[PDB]
Amino acid sequence: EAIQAYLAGHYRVPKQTLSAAAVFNDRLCVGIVASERAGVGKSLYVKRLHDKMKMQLNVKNVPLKTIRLIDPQVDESRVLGALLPFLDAQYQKVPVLFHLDVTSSVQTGIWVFLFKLLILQYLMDINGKMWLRNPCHLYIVEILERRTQFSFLDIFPKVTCRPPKEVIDMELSALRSDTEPGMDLWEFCSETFQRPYQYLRRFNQNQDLDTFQYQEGSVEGTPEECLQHFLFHCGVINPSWSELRNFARFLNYQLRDCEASLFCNPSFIGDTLRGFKKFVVTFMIFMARDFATPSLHTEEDLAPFSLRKRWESEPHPYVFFNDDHTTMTFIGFHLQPNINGSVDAISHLTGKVIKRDVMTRDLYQGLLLQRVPFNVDFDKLPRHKKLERLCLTLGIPQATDPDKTYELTTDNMLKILAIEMRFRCGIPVIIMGETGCGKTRLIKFLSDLRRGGTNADTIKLVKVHGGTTADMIYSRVREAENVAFANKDQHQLDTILFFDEANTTEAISCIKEVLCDHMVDGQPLAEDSGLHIIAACNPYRKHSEEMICRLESAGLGYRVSMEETADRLGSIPLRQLVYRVHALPPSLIPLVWDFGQLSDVAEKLYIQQIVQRLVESISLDENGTRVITEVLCASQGFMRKTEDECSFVSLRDVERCVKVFRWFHEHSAMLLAQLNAFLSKSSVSKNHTERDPVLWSLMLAIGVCYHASLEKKDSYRKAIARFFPKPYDDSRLLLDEITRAQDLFLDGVPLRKTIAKNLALKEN
Ligand SMILES: Nc1ncnc2c1ncn2[C@@H]1O[C@H](COP(=O)(O)OP(=O)(O)OP(=O)(O)O)[C@@H](O)[C@H]1O
């Protein structure tokens, strides 16, 4: 208390000196907004305080500078360089709110930097440019609680934001102080859809529980019961503010589209339409579970980064409203009438009931009499009809297919619909999936479908390296904004920026900035620009223990002990994860959802497409196509089954093995001529037989892309030979052919007399 009072007394500004501290508590020109959770309001305060600065300070403009630090070791030269443009005399006497945001990524140097800036009032570098604090600029520092006698953070004035439960728990009565913010009185714009009030308090149907007319435009409740009605149907137990915001936004959009067409005053539409509003409210609150509830869990550090709601888990209802204002879109439930005058919702194919009494027999007959797209199954439908249906649901009225190779299953359609729905709501879309999981193909197909026929670049997929700094990300996002403005002006198209491998950088908080805050380096993103931003993350998975032991036992190992390595995601070294990813921002975890799992049928289809993309250059046979497809599929099956020598397999290995096979086939004539000459040079008699170029090329390509990098080569050969034609299915023959090829390749150099010809030198 003594330290807190000392710093409060020394941080106070005199009443006569004009300062920006007039908005903060009792004229203190130092602030610390902090909380233990993520996404609870730390920055709808530094915005509200700016909002209350303009109308309360009688100044034409009050400069706002947002400085965000993302380097794990906090760099003070960056902060000094950011503050230097605000050092000229013009800003030396005007109020300047300075907001400094320290991200979760930062770990070392926070306390020293805070003691250097807030207390020591200075910042200095080697060059000599000093920056001195003035008691006229607010210095609010927004920080996540670095929970581990007191931390070096309570000595400053603090405004602890609270999730939206502790607001309803501790603040039972709306005292509304400046230390514990509650429901913002401004935040009744999209949270005002308190139709929950009506269908809940009016439980019985006949009392006009949802009536024949409800709308929005003015408030009708108190800002302490909205937060309670949004907690009963939220689904999440202890939501943050950026978990109720998304749930309210989705419900607002869907009820807004509900009060659209087919919600009017016809003569004999159903003559009652009883329960239609009840159906909408109940069923879309049910389907909000897919869009609001987190998918990740609530090998120590990988526990939060472990998927629980995989795409193959509980189904997805996904009702849409066909923004052309004509019909609905029932895509994922196939409702079935219950025995006792009710109707329930089942799975797409299983038929298991997922929810009960969603909708009633009377309105069932009313809807079927209205010819709604109900009980339609996209699994067995023509491609033309499927594309027309999904194009109508998506909004564009055209029908030109942008591709034919890309199949359209029900699970692959409910995945495009998810992204489109999150785009039209406002929820940022971030997907978790392995390399070659089909996310990039789906995004490209959706972008081309949006394009239709225009030659516009509505896709800007950015492969984000491990060495992508903040400057590159900011430059790319502003370039994408400019291109989105251009495409919205010329051809009126919605551009898509795509950050592949989002979580593989030391600066990931920048992507969180771009996605959640809609703010680039501090400057807000231009609203209503048509730019939609997607992120894709690599899964958090550890190697198998035997594979780690094998990697450590390869040569001389790491130069020093394994434990002391600096590259750590918590405790696990980055050398033990399949993808060398970094820690996700805590305000991005609720958003992440599993893209899905590649199915064996889909994998076979992709392999068949790849091999058919080879005939036009090689003129392969049907037998050749079949043998190549089977060999490659079984090769990935083996590599995915061997967890000791191959952590993960990808579809991008077939497009490399087929490339090597193509090279070998195109050189096969001269290769086989030289091999025959070399064998003739040997003492072996004329035992050479016919060598099929297709087989002699696949036999050797799998001996490079799959076989010669393993340790259990014999098992691979014995599990792969059975897919070869009849006169060639021998593991001994596989090894013999590979050895003959290596012997031929080695012969052709002037190797010295006393140089060993091992199986290692030839292989190398
Ligand atoms: N009463 C409220 N207090 C705080 N936020 C609210 C409130 N009502 C609605 N919200 C919404 O909650 C969201 C919280 O987002 P905000 O930017 O405040 O999170 P944050 O504190 O910046 O978290 P982080 O810094 O970890 O991203 C805001 O975008 C705001 O629109």
Ligand SMILES: [Mg+2]
């Ligand atoms: Mg923030």
